[PDB]
Design a protein around this ligand. Sequence first.
Ligand SMILES: CSc1ncnc2c1ncn2[C@@H]1O[C@H](CO)[C@@H](O)[C@H]1O
Ligand SMILES: CSc1ncnc2c1ncn2[C@@H]1O[C@H](CO)[C@@H](O)[C@H]1O
Ligand SMILES: CSc1ncnc2c1ncn2[C@@H]1O[C@H](CO)[C@@H](O)[C@H]1O
Ligand SMILES: CSc1ncnc2c1ncn2[C@@H]1O[C@H](CO)[C@@H](O)[C@H]1O
Ligand SMILES: CSc1ncnc2c1ncn2[C@@H]1O[C@H](CO)[C@@H](O)[C@H]1O
Ligand SMILES: CSc1ncnc2c1ncn2[C@@H]1O[C@H](CO)[C@@H](O)[C@H]1O
Lengths: 237, 234, 232, 234, 232, 237
Amino acid sequence: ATPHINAEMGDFADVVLMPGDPLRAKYIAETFLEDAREVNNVRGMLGFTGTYKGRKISVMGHGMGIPSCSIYTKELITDFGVKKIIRVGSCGAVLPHVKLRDVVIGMGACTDSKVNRIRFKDHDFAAIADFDMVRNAVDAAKALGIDARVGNLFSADLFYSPDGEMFDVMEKYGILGVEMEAAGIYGVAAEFGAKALTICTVSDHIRTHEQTTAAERQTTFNDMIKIALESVLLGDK
Amino acid sequence: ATPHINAEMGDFADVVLMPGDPLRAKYIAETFLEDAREVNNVRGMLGFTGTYKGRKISVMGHGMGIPSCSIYTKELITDFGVKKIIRVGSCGAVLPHVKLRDVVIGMGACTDSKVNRIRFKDHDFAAIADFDMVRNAVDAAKALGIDARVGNLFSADLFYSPDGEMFDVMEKYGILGVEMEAAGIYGVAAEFGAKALTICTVSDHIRTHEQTTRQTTFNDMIKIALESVLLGDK
Amino acid sequence: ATPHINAEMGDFADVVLMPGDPLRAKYIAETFLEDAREVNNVRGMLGFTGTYKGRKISVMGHGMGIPSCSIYTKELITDFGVKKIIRVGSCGAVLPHVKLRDVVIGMGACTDSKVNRIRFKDHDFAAIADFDMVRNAVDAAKALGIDARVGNLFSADLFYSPDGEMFDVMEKYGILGVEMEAAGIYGVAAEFGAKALTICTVSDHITTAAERQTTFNDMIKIALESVLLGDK
Amino acid sequence: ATPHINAEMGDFADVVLMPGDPLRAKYIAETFLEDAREVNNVRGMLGFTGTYKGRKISVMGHGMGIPSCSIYTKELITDFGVKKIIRVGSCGAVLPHVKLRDVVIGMGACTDSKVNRIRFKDHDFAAIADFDMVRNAVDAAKALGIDARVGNLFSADLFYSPDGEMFDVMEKYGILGVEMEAAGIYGVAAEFGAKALTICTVSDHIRTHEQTTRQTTFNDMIKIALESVLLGDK
Amino acid sequence: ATPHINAEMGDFADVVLMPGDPLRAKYIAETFLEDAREVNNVRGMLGFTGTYKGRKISVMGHGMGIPSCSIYTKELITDFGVKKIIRVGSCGAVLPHVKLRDVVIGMGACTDSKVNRIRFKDHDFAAIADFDMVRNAVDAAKALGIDARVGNLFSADLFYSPDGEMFDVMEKYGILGVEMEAAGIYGVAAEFGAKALTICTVSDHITTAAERQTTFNDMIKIALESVLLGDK
Amino acid sequence: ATPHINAEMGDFADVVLMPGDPLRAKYIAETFLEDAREVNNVRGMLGFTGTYKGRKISVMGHGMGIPSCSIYTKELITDFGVKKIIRVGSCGAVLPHVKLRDVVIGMGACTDSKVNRIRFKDHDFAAIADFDMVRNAVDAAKALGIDARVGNLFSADLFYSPDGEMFDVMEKYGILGVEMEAAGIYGVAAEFGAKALTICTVSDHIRTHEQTTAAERQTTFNDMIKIALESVLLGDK
Ligand SMILES: CSc1ncnc2c1ncn2[C@@H]1O[C@H](CO)[C@@H](O)[C@H]1O
Ligand SMILES: CSc1ncnc2c1ncn2[C@@H]1O[C@H](CO)[C@@H](O)[C@H]1O
Ligand SMILES: CSc1ncnc2c1ncn2[C@@H]1O[C@H](CO)[C@@H](O)[C@H]1O
Ligand SMILES: CSc1ncnc2c1ncn2[C@@H]1O[C@H](CO)[C@@H](O)[C@H]1O
Ligand SMILES: CSc1ncnc2c1ncn2[C@@H]1O[C@H](CO)[C@@H](O)[C@H]1O
Ligand SMILES: CSc1ncnc2c1ncn2[C@@H]1O[C@H](CO)[C@@H](O)[C@H]1O
């Protein structure tokens, strides 16, 4: 066990899906995994392990922010033999053409944080996902009849920013989705030699700040989970 | 209700104790508050409101890291009329004269986060607590016969730091405890106009590696916090 | 028409291959393109436009360094309607498993330059390529029976850096190759809404001339065939 | 003798009050100390030692700016056994509720200087005062019936700032006074292992432009400082 | 011999004039030097060594940008024994009193690049020229009845900057001209203990071709005559 | 008058020599100026005005550090019509070949301070002296049979540096002298449109940390003052 995870080697699959909300990990295990069992509960960060079409899969929340998810992903990789981390969350949109419910894939992730500069001798480290994982996700989505956008995400330290001028900048440079973990998870994956990918569903459009129907929203979120789970199967081949 | 808190104005007291662990807040509500009522569970971030010796008080977790607690402390202050925030967490020690379960009070908080530089034109903003609250905590500790050092805390973005050498620099400058949110709460208190204080319990020693896997001294911290608000009311 | 390219709209294809060495532009034009014609000569940066299996293609050097290539890529995009930029160059490897003559594809590009911070309010902008272009290059490579590594490049401002330990850091974080333009082209593409990709061959690990020419022609075929896959 | 102080161990008391103006130190030595003896005049930086109600005390100017006071506070601490440094200076106000001659106590000090980043690996070091000294000053003020706000000061490198907008940011974050050395003295106290406190008198208002061209409230500041050491001795 | 210059010790004079445009090196060699011979052609960066009034002089382009010129100036200094580097180029002016075709001499060079911070532990390194070289250029100019302004240049990494207000700042602090290499060459000279100087002619204010050629030849004569004054 | 200078327009010459030590300004006025009168004393920063061979000259201390001298030089220029500022101080040497008593002229000045970054939008402002003033000083020195070195100075914020590694860096990049004001005075001169020059006498060699005889040291310091005063006369022509 670690100070944040009360499990032992073997308790997690070598692939872990990670939502920000611990209650969403439980929701994913309940909805898509067969014979899922809770393998962690410290600080209430629920983790589960079960099978998806016979494949051993794990899903655990990572909390909000780079500092939070950096702790969990780091421990999964070094102490639980986890090779892949697939973040499945929500994000806000700044581009007029990026619509509510669009599925975004973060090939790269820009950031507000100083963590990668601390890692990269104060220079610019391009926080990127694992290419194969990106490709598997794109292909899985195509098979589901879904067209995911692949580009940059922006991982913020302040959900409530003081200088609202950053949104124009994000939009100017083509940022697809705004969230809070991608850049940190990619930094961890690179530092400890593992593979990661962040997929998000647009739950808010900053240009119009909205949400829309709930049934349709829940549908897209599930497609996103489906895309994540199906993508690991393509990777297995 | 706010984006991360499903409650209404009035559900929270004007003072809120906040541990990083939502399960610790539940424990505090059950062990120290009377008529405790759960007022939030969004994302599992348990929040409670009750009374301590007739004083209405709340306790809610804020999660790990500056980005997490910034969201919660902000919504409480702008939408629930919270005047005082008292973080009650754990920390790692770097100084040799600091032992497990020791109580530290961060009158100040250093950090490797950029949040305050983003707020202060890229200059040095000294993330400090409210002086009265510090004084209150010190007096409360004194009256309870519990020891407590007052000084600088270090709020880290990375629990697993790739720069181990920075611990020597922290030690060289007298850092009492290494935690992950004080500097962010102080920055929020300042930006949104409220007051805050961070009290921590040494739960691990970065040099010796001896660590906990809680309570008691964690109960002391709570007593000091709860008793300090009462002094503040008078 | 532009300060560094004496040509007019239409002279360049919407896709432009760009080597660092200007002399390589003519080699590519004569060796891989049909009906090539000269479209630029300013400062000796020769540009050519021709066709590859019917597809309109242009080729012109960009010079060494982020500042140089940022000028050309920018002008091509805003004044000649270029949609995609494919940089085809060389790099140095810091990883033991990455060998001489290997073909590296930069999905991302780190850098010690300050250009992107100037663009992104002093924050971290992840300089990245277009995903489809990356995927096209990979598939075009496999079709040619060539195994290409996809990952991060490091775009250096100083070829002769005084900081020797930075190479160990690059190795620790999996940098595939060290060159000097990727991060700059990716920033320009982002700033002006175009697509870019950097392909490099390992020409030094931190070979015969015939071996070098073979690998160079392989990189060009890959880039050219990737463009065709992109059109589908 | 040190590079900038021609004195020997023992010439200074373990506590030293320090204004930026050498002529103010002379005034303090002549108005509040008995048997005042000049112990330094190198570069005109007048230093004096005497007694206040039987308590041995020194007062020496430190000049304007972080670079100047860093030299003096350092030599005093490493070569003359000075344990406590109490800066008694002037400052400019940005807040509307702050008037001339008001007394401010910097429990913390923000800055646009790089000195602390050079010491703290380019991270945010919270330049704070010694809690006991702050508390001492507060009690002393209380007993003397003098008002005093406790909080953050802003130590500027450029008195004539080209970034006027930074004053709005200072005001937004509750800066009590704009001065030029607190953050540097706190950094030195920390690096060389001593204690320090900065007390200031509002001598100018950056918004209204009304300003002084001293004493009295400048006499209050001195009383608070001298009386605070006595409380500290007990 | 070096990665970017196929020459050997002795091929280059201890003094090298360097224009940004590579094509200008041959013009200078044929127009101002006696008995010129070719000493480099790698990447099309032609270098020549000849003599001016008996004094041994070399000329070769450096490309656009700090990264490009940093490579050439460095190699020339550490492998070909070059003692002085005189960059002769063009720049844009932000000051109203500085006119088109004016000759500007950069005693100092500001920059938005990060190379010198990387060299100077993230602090402020004042990138400056050799004082004697500056004084020589001034005196050589006066002898030619030419009035040259001495001051600060600004070495930009991005010719097309997204920050429009930086030009007002440059004007406020007296920047004489905007170009892209001075600060990089000055850093290299400092790092490897050599001497450097940047001379520029105002080719744009933020003219006929005959006017341009006249002023260009004036800058070259100035540089060449300054070298002779330096030998005294 | 200003909050730091109790004088009125006319009290200072349009040229001001400035030593760090206020007691040294008095020494300079006494030693080289005819009919010098004290024109300032607030905070004890003595200022004087007199004539050198018939030319109206002023000399006033500027205190230690960039923040200190930035206040004085700024007020001299904007409120007292001063056109030129000639700093005359001492510095430490890091280069083995730069010897005790050498006269150094700061054509440029490197710095530890953040003041010029605050002025120059966070970029690199090359803090330089006025060319003509440098030339006049070099020529005046030649006339005195003195050979001054012209190059970069380093203006430090911390006389007592924590990371002693900066001296190797300074030496590596050819820094001639180490002091504490040049970069700040040049920044002020550029911001308010005036002319400045810093000249220093090496009073310490960091590689050997020494001083030597006192008579000879005092001789070189005076030559430096002579060079400064004589240089303004050449400038007048
Ligand atoms: C401006 S809209 C927005 N902004 C920032 N984060 C968002 C946003 N929308 C969804 N997320 C992500 O969810 C958490 C913060 O609520 C975080 O876990 C984060 O990833
Ligand atoms: C090196 S020991 C250490 N390091 C960092 N944070 C620690 C530490 N010990 C306790 N905490 C605090 O608790 C959470 C991280 O477990 C965070 O909420 C944090 O405040
Ligand atoms: C340390 S080995 C190395 N380092 C940097 N750049 C290299 C390197 N090898 C090839 N290139 C690329 O070629 C040019 C610099 O020669 C540039 O165009 C650059 O892309
Ligand atoms: C904008 S008003 C202002 N600004 C900056 N410093 C001030 C100010 N007022 C008083 N001081 C302090 O006194 C000296 C500068 O005069 C310095 O010692 C400084 O601490
Ligand atoms: C805003 S006008 C301008 N800006 C930047 N560089 C200029 C400029 N004018 C001439 N140069 C110099 O020529 C090359 C860039 O064209 C580079 O070699 C450069 O030195
Ligand atoms: C390491 S030797 C050294 N270091 C720094 N400053 C020196 C030095 N020597 C002379 N000065 C200058 O004198 C004052 C500091 O004593 C300051 O005014 C400064 O200009």
